[PDB]
Amino acid sequence: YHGGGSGFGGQLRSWNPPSESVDAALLPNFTRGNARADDLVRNNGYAANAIQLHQDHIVGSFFRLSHRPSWRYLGIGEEEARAFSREVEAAWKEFAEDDCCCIDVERKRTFTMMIREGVAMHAFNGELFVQATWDTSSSRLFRTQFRMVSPKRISNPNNTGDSRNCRAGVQINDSGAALGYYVSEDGYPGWMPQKWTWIPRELPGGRASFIHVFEPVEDGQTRGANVFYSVMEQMKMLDTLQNTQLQSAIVKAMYAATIESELDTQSAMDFILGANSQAAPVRLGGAKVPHLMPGDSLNLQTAQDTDNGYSVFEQSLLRYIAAGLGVSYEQLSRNYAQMSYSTARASANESWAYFMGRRKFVASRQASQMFLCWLEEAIVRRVVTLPSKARFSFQEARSAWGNCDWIGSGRMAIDGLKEVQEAVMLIEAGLSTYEKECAKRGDDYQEIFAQQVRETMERRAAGLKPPAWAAA
Amino acid sequence: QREGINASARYPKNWVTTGDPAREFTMIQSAPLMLLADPDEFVSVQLA
Amino acid sequence: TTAQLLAANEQKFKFDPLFLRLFFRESYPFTTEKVYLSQIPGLVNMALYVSPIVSGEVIRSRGGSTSEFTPGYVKPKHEVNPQMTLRRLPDEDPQNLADPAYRRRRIIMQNMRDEELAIAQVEEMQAVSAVLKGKYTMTGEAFDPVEVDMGRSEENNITQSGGTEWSKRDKSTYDPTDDIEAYALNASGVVNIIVFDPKGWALFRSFKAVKEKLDTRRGSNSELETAVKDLGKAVSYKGMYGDVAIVVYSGQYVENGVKKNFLPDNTMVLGNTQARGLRTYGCIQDADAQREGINASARYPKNWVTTGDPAREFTMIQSAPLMLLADPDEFVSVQLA
Amino acid sequence: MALYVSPIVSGEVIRSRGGSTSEFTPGYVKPKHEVNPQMTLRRLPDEDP
């Protein structure tokens, strides 16, 4: 094994990194790394493109709830479960998508915006926090409100060092679980002493009182690390290179010509450059042929090729950045060079696998926890009715009553006609269903059927031709 | 500069010196200067 | 002339906390300046005959006494500087080798091991000195002298003299069991364990009658180990002697370069395995320590960097302990001259 | 053993410890034997006639 040795000819002798856990290798330089990632996001053209792609493809424009409680385990019945699902779904749609934006305390976003901001925070910071609180003065029906807590606001009390039970503002029991998080308040206007407050992870009633979502790697990782840690240095150096090249081009193309002489610099520029004597401005119209005495001379400089291979080196670095961050090269760089159909489809698939993985984990888990946190109040407040003769009540099995799936926007095809023929061919055979086909297009098939049966009756009533789906 | 502060009001800080013993300090500093746009809208009599 | 480092051992003195395990359980940290230890006399006069006419001599009700104690403070420290890391370490192969960054994490580990061992030795010494004698004084160079003095009656800590010393009288046709009985008659509460220094054990075991106490068909139920049983260990659980277990303790603590024995040259202790023992720890006094929110804890660790030109990354442990004994009359110490 | 130190006064730094090394080198040995057919032509002591 040459890997663990000195190397080829001792080239690697000075490459012997210490073997430390993820906590020991991340926690000392957490805030500086997160701040650098924030600087890259807020001040670089490609980072904002990557974050916008993350938000737009993982979640999209609309984010929908699909409720499928487990009836067989609970032994309640088909129709009771279906009625419960329909009623609770309608209640959620008329609580989540409210215009007043009363779901969150700040009154600035809707639910889909909260999910998008959570995904973004998971992108350029490594985790996301949600706090669910109650306000008594709320006179509306459901009250649970939500807030997004920035990771920077969570830190150790009194800025003390890290300990065995509390690392980077997160308390840890004997095992790897979490109990409560210290959340500071930060006051931009003029500062204050600063305060650290305790918020337990879960109330003694089992309700989710504080949400912490991330994807771990090792056995023990108290707080996750963002995705930019691979390619921060390359992106900053690339930005420096681009600015330097631009400034160099501006300063090289500036000096068009050069006058050599022995006279006064006013008469020399008068007699050769043609500037009006009354430094010396020149009017820029016409073609001029100067006359030069033996000592004088006129020289027209030549600049280098302004982009002498810099585009190719940018391609190399941008492909590296695309490999690091996760989005494909064409989506990141907007280049979209010449390519066949197979190349485009393959690249789209390699992007889509990652996007579906991220949506299925991060945003889906966040939305599921938020939805469970609301149901309990609505159940407790007697807004919805639990089916009778149930094996369990809500508390004994939370995940049984609230097993739900989320459907967002689907892929936009390169050639949808081929995809439509794919869907129709699968539908004619047995390999697929209407539910899965309507899900790929981001539609709920029961809504489609209800609109369908309303529409066939509307067409029949007015005297139009009966539609295709109508029963003979 | 380490935490990006300039021209604020009553900035406090709390630090502990890394010495062989240990002591804890607390200090607030600010730059108060009071001005009037027009120095003359008041008349101040000393009475008797 | 290249070389290899095949073996690199360590040395260690025979150290094992016997006393602090047998008698001092149930540690009691306290967030308080000083502690109290109280005792009540509990001596009642035998009633005096009085005529049915006199009707006098009202008796006082008994009241106890209290004692206050204050713990001392200990803080060993070590350090590492960039100068020492450069050259080499004797535990590291001449082949292989590592960067100075890795050698920074060996000196630190062995340092922490050393001051932890120093704290443990101090705890053991402070525990042992409270058994042999009722009192001990906590003194040093930078520490003002503070003493803790439980009330142990003069009848205890019996020391032998020109009359009735085991060495001067013969090793045949004599029995030390009667002497043990007479010594233990001053204890308050049943005795169950006897601690011997090795010289004292060699002096006690050599009696001829004690041998007959071992190999008699019906005159005893004791069993011992006259042969050699433990040679390198610091403890030796020899067999029971009638009812009291016989334990031989020979441990070592090093003050300055030299080694010394905890038990001083053949002393005997008559003791009980369930004697009420107090293991108290005071409040640690450091600004960062209280900034963490911790107080009255054992072995607070910390480190820092002094920013000075040669740098240096120190390390410190501090406990501030105090080992007390609630009932100082359940042990009877014997010199065994 | 850890000497007592007051909470106010800074305690002395205690020296770390370092080891000692020794050197050794092996020794070589080679026994040898030789066989020629003149020894094998005759009859060995423990062979049946």
Per-residue H/E/C for A19-86:
CCCHHHHHHHHHHHHHHHHHHHHHHCHHHHHHHHHHHHHHCCCCCEEEECCCHHHHCCCHHHHHHHHH
Backbone φ and ψ of C103, nearest 5°: -70, -15
Residues 6+ apart with CB under 8 A from A5: none
Inform me whether the C-beta atom of residue C304 falls under 8 Å from chain A C-beta atoms: no
Decide: C300 and C318 in contact? Cβ < 8 Å.
yes
Decide: A128 and A121 in contact? Cβ < 8 Å.
yes
Residue with tokens 């001029």: A288
Long-range contacts of B26-34, Cβ-Cβ distance < 8 Å, separation of 24 or more: none
Q: SS3 for D32?
A: coil
Handedness of CA A82, A85, A91, A93 (dihedral sign): negative
Q: How far is B21 from chain A (nearest CA, A)?
A: 17
CB pairs under 8 A between C and D: 74
Distance of CA C208 to the CA centre of its chain: 32
Give the full edge-to-edge strand order of the sheet including C77-78.
C77-78, C315-318, C300-302
Residue among A14, A18, A160 whose CB faces C102 most closely: A18
How is residue C305 annotated by DSSP? Answer: B
Q: SS3 for C100?
A: helix
Q: SS3 for D13?
A: coil
C3: left (phi over 0), alpha (psi -120 to 50) or beta: beta
In terms of Cβ atoms closer than 10 Å to its own Cβ (0-12, 13-18, 19+), residue A457 is exposed
Q: SS3 for C219?
A: coil
The beta strand positions in chain C, using DSSP E, are 27-29, 35-39, 65-69, 77-78, 135-138, 146-149, 193-196, 235-241, 244-249, 252-254, 259-261, 268-271, 277-281, 300-302, 315-318, 321-325, 332-334
Query: Measured between alpha carbons, how far is A318 from A332 in angstroms, rounded to an integer?
Result: 8
Nearest to C18 by CA among C269, C286, C280: C269
- A34's tokens: 């997160």
- Helix (H) / strand (E) element for C116: namely helix C100-132
- End-to-end, the C-alpha distance of chain B in Å comes to 54
Query: Measured between alpha carbons, how far is C228 from A372 in angstroms, rounded to an integer?
Result: 72
Helices within A171-328 (DSSP H only): 232-254, 265-271, 310-325
- Do B22 and C286 lie within an 8 Å CB cutoff? yes
- A258's tokens: 């050069």
Decide: C296 and C31 in contact? Cβ < 8 Å.
yes
DSSP-derived secondary structure for A343-388: HHHHHHHHHHHHHHHHIIIIIHHHHHHHHHHHHHHHHHTTSS-PPS
Query: Measured between alpha carbons, how far is C96 from A3 in angstroms, rounded to an integer?
Result: 14
Breaks after residues in chain A, judged by C–N over 2.5 Å = 278
Chains with at least 3 CB pairs less than 8 angstroms from chain D: B, C
Nearest to C246 by CA among C199, C185, C201, C179: C201
CA dihedral A374, A378, A379, A382 (to 10 degrees): 170
B7: left (phi over 0), alpha (psi -120 to 50) or beta: left
- A183's tokens: 């959340």
Decide: A167 and A176 in contact? Cβ < 8 Å.
no
Decide: C134 and C332 in contact? Cβ < 8 Å.
no
Please provide the size of chain C in residues. 337
Query: Measured between alpha carbons, how far is C288 from D7 in angstroms, rounded to an integer?
Result: 14
Query: Measured between alpha carbons, how far is A206 from A370 in angstroms, rounded to an integer?
Result: 14
Backbone φ and ψ of A58, nearest 5°: -65, -50
Query: Measured between alpha carbons, how far is C303 from D13 in angstroms, rounded to an integer?
Result: 13
Neighbouring CB atoms inside 10 A of A334's CB total 9
Residue with tokens 């699902």: A85
Neighbouring CB atoms inside 10 A of A36's CB total 17
Query: Measured between alpha carbons, how far is A57 from A73 in angstroms, rounded to an integer?
Result: 35
Decide: A156 and A169 in contact? Cβ < 8 Å.
yes
Query: Measured between alpha carbons, how far is B16 from A159 in angstroms, rounded to an integer?
Result: 11
Cα radius of gyration (chain B): 21
Query: Measured between alpha carbons, how far is C132 from C19 in angstroms, rounded to an integer?
Result: 11
Nearest to C298 by CA among C320, C313, C330, C276: C320
Helices within C216-297 (DSSP H only): 287-292
3-state DSSP percent of chain D in helix, strand and coil, to 5: 10, 0, 90
How is residue A180 annotated by DSSP? Answer: E
Neighbouring CB atoms inside 10 A of C59's CB total 9
Give the type of residue at A403: N
Neighbouring CB atoms inside 10 A of A176's CB total 11
Query: Measured between alpha carbons, how far is A451 from C174 in angstroms, rounded to an integer?
Result: 114
Decide: A322 and A332 in contact? Cβ < 8 Å.
yes
Do chain A and C touch: 3 or more Cβ pairs under 8 angstroms?
yes
Residue with tokens 């991340």: A26
Strands A210-213 and A64-67: unpaired
- Do A190 and B9 lie within an 8 Å CB cutoff? yes
Decide: A64 and A408 in contact? Cβ < 8 Å.
yes
Query: Measured between alpha carbons, how far is A134 from A374 in angstroms, rounded to an integer?
Result: 11
| Experiment type | cryo-EM
- A115's tokens: 């999910």
- Do C291 and B18 lie within an 8 Å CB cutoff? no
Decide: A358 and A115 in contact? Cβ < 8 Å.
no
Do chain D and C touch: 3 or more Cβ pairs under 8 angstroms?
yes
Neighbouring CB atoms inside 10 A of A409's CB total 16
CA distances from A219 to A175, A227, C56, C187 (A): 11, 19, 82, 57
Decide: A359 and A352 in contact? Cβ < 8 Å.
no
Q: SS3 for C313?
A: strand
Decide: C89 and C103 in contact? Cβ < 8 Å.
yes
Q: SS3 for C333?
A: strand
Handedness of CA C99, C100, C101, C104 (dihedral sign): positive
What residues of D are in contact with residue C306 (Cβ under 8 Å)?
Answer: none
What residues of D are in contact with residue C144 (Cβ under 8 Å)?
Answer: 6
How is residue A230 annotated by DSSP? Answer: G
Nearest to C122 by CA among C255, C21, C24, C31: C255
Residue among C73, C77, C138 whose CB faces D14 most closely: C77
Handedness of CA C212, C214, C220, C224 (dihedral sign): positive
Residues 6+ apart with CB under 8 A from C86: C100
Q: Taking each helix axis from N to C terminus, what angle separates A30-43 and A45-58, rounded to the nearest 10 degrees?
A: 90
Nearest to A216 by CA among A54, A397, A22, A355: A22
Q: SS3 for A449?
A: helix
In terms of Cβ atoms closer than 10 Å to its own Cβ (0-12, 13-18, 19+), residue A179 is middle
- B1's tokens: 């500069």
- A227's tokens: 């995705």
What is the dotted CATH code of the domain comprising C154-276+328-335? 3.30.1930.10
Long-range contacts of A438-446, Cβ-Cβ distance < 8 Å, separation of 24 or more: A439/A407, A439/A410, A440/A410, A440/A411, A441/A410, A442/A60, A442/A62, A442/A64, A442/A407, A442/A408, A442/A409, A442/A410, A444/A64, A444/A66, A444/A407
In terms of Cβ atoms closer than 10 Å to its own Cβ (0-12, 13-18, 19+), residue A276 is exposed
Q: Which of C2, C4, C10, C77 to probe by mutation at the D interface, max D CB count within 10 Å?
A: C77
Query: Measured between alpha carbons, how far is C192 from C202 in angstroms, rounded to an integer?
Result: 21
Long-range contacts of A271-280, Cβ-Cβ distance < 8 Å, separation of 24 or more: A271/A296, A272/A296, A272/A298
Handedness of CA A294, A295, A298, A299 (dihedral sign): positive
